[PDB]
Design a protein around this ligand. Sequence first.
Ligand SMILES: NS(=O)(=O)c1ccc(N/N=C2\C(=O)Nc3ccc4[nH]nnc4c32)cc1
Length: 283
Amino acid sequence: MENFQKVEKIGEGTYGVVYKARNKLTGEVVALKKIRLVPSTAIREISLLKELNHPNIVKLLDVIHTENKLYLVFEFLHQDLKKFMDASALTGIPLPLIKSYLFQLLQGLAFCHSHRVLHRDLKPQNLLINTEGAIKLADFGLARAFGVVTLWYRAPEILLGCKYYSTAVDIWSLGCIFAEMVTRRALFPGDSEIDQLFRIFRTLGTPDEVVWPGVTSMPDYKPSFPKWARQDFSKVVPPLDEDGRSLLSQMLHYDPNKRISAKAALAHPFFQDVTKPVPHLRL
Ligand SMILES: NS(=O)(=O)c1ccc(N/N=C2\C(=O)Nc3ccc4[nH]nnc4c32)cc1
């Protein structure tokens, strides 16, 4: 760690504090994450993530295991989607830019999912943007490598106690983020696990055996859950057009098996006119 000069704290992530730092020998500017606790399985799993490169994935440059402490060295980007959405709150992110960002994030998910790597904790704070119009997902695979607080983007199967969740959890989180970019407000801002679950039910309807076979047998499912009627997406994400609402509805299906995959979502008619605009970034 003597090879790195810390510039400033970037933030406090799920698995540790992130710092902007300079590599003293190469002059490289990086993001350094100090993992808060090292287990041998975690080292091997993290080491496999170093081989996982894609233009829409934040590069894991190095794993440093020293003095019983673990540091992850990553590619640095200048802004996260949270700060960008806050800066764009008065005017809204232009629809062509939301579409480009959604398309790129789906390419990133499709890539990780093809390698059986899941994120599990997607949120605006771990989506990073640059001046070229790119957006990249940070922290893929860390949840599985380390094991085990914003609940807003959590898939209903996780909230209902499914232990063996799938790649569909990331599609759910990304659907939530897509809605938030469009409306400029969080879709499901729950402040407890039950409030998160009930906010989902009040919008999409309380799930039942018809829409989600096996739901009633889930570990945390209670027959005493109130039964709310589903709402129209036209009320949920105005002024998003029919193509966007159709795609979003597929990303927010209750049954993880019915939920659209990243690969199938890339083929959705919503992306027929996708482009790559340049955002106005104030750094
Ligand atoms: N709020 S803000 O716009 O001023 C702002 C600016 C830069 C950053 N960068 N973050 C990270 C980075 O560059 N690489 C990684 C890799 C893994 C991570 N996990 N969590 N974060 C990261 C980051 C985040 C927020």
